[PDB]
Each structure stands twice: as structure tokens, then as C-alpha cells.
Design a protein around this ligand. Structure first.
Ligand SMILES: Cc1cc(S(=O)(=O)Nc2ccnn2C)c(C)cc1Cl
Length: 135
């Protein structure tokens, strides 16, 4: 029957980005990776099978894929090649994705707003907002 993340499931395309270069700088991404990653217009493909959620992020820069159970830490290699320990939870209908590495932390929130999927990436005081629409 109907379930936890139904409104997230599907194929989404990036339509706007703000402050992503600054977010990446704060994370520690180097110049060349920032330039090429920042150009990209990824799709995000979200699916659910039982308790397992899969998020694929695909662009001309990189294809990534994570599968996880809410609340259960996992290893992730990010598109910029960080090796992080991640935990994703649902907080009042928002997917909250925390990545920990080298004593640092970043949080990515994904939420449904109208017909969009809005992604907010936060590293210390710097936020990037990335808006997706259905493909
Ligand atoms: C590097 C990077 C990538 C992302 S992403 O948007 O999920 N994926 C992305 C960007 C460009 N191509 N692809 C697949 C995010 C949220 C953060 C960071 Cl630092």
C-alpha cells in the first residue's frame, strides 16, 4: 500500500541551482571539480523497494547511486570523491541526509514542494538550493 516516501519516487531533472559553487567551496571541493560539477544538470531517480530507498544522481559529470534504510548508517563515495559515513532519516516529511568525514559534516535536505523536489545543501553557514521537476 501507500508509503513513506511515495511522493519522492520518480525521475526528476534539475531546473535551477543557487550558490552551489560556494557550497562546494565550503565542503572543500577543488577548482576543476567545482567547475565541471557545477555545469551539470543532473537527474535524480528515486525508488523504494520495501525498506530500501535508492537514490541515483546522474549527470555528464558523474553517476552516483546510494541505497539505504532510514536511520541506518552507510558508506558513501560522493561525486567529488569524498569517502563519507552517511545517515538518512525522515523528519516530518523531509529526507535529511547527513555526511560525516574528516571531522566535518554536511546536511542535504530533500522535500516535496508543490510539483517540485527542493534540495537544500548546507555546509556551516553556506546553503545551496537546487530545484528539480519531474522528468
Ligand atoms: C559534488 C556534489 C554533487 C551533488 S549532486 O547534485 O547530488 N550530484 C551531482 C552534481 C553534478 N552531477 N551530479 C551527479 C551534491 C548534492 C553535492 C556535491 Cl558536493
Amino acid at each position: 500500500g501507500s508509503h513513506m516516501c511515495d511522493a519522492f519516487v520518480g525521475t526528476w531533472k534539475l531546473v535551477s541551482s543557487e550558490n552551489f559553487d560556494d557550497y562546494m567551496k565550503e565542503v572543500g571541493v577543488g577548482f576543476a571539480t567545482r567547475k565541471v560539477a557545477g555545469m551539470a544538470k543532473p537527474n535524480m531517480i528515486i525508488s523504494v523497494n520495501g525498506d530500501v530507498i535508492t537514490i541515483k544522481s546522474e549527470s555528464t559529470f558523474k553517476n552516483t547511486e546510494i541505497s539505504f534504510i532510514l536511520g541506518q548508517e552507510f558508506d558513501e563515495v560522493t561525486a567529488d570523491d569524498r569517502k563519507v559515513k552517511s545517515t538518512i532519516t525522515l523528519d516530518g516529511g523531509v529526507l535529511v541526509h547527513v555526511q560525516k568525514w574528516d571531522g566535518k559534516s554536511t546536511t542535504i535536505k530533500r522535500k516535496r514542494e508543490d510539483d517540485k523536489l527542493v534540495v537544500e545543501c548546507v555546509m556551516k553557514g553556506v546553503t545551496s538550493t537546487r530545484v528539480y521537476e519531474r522528468a
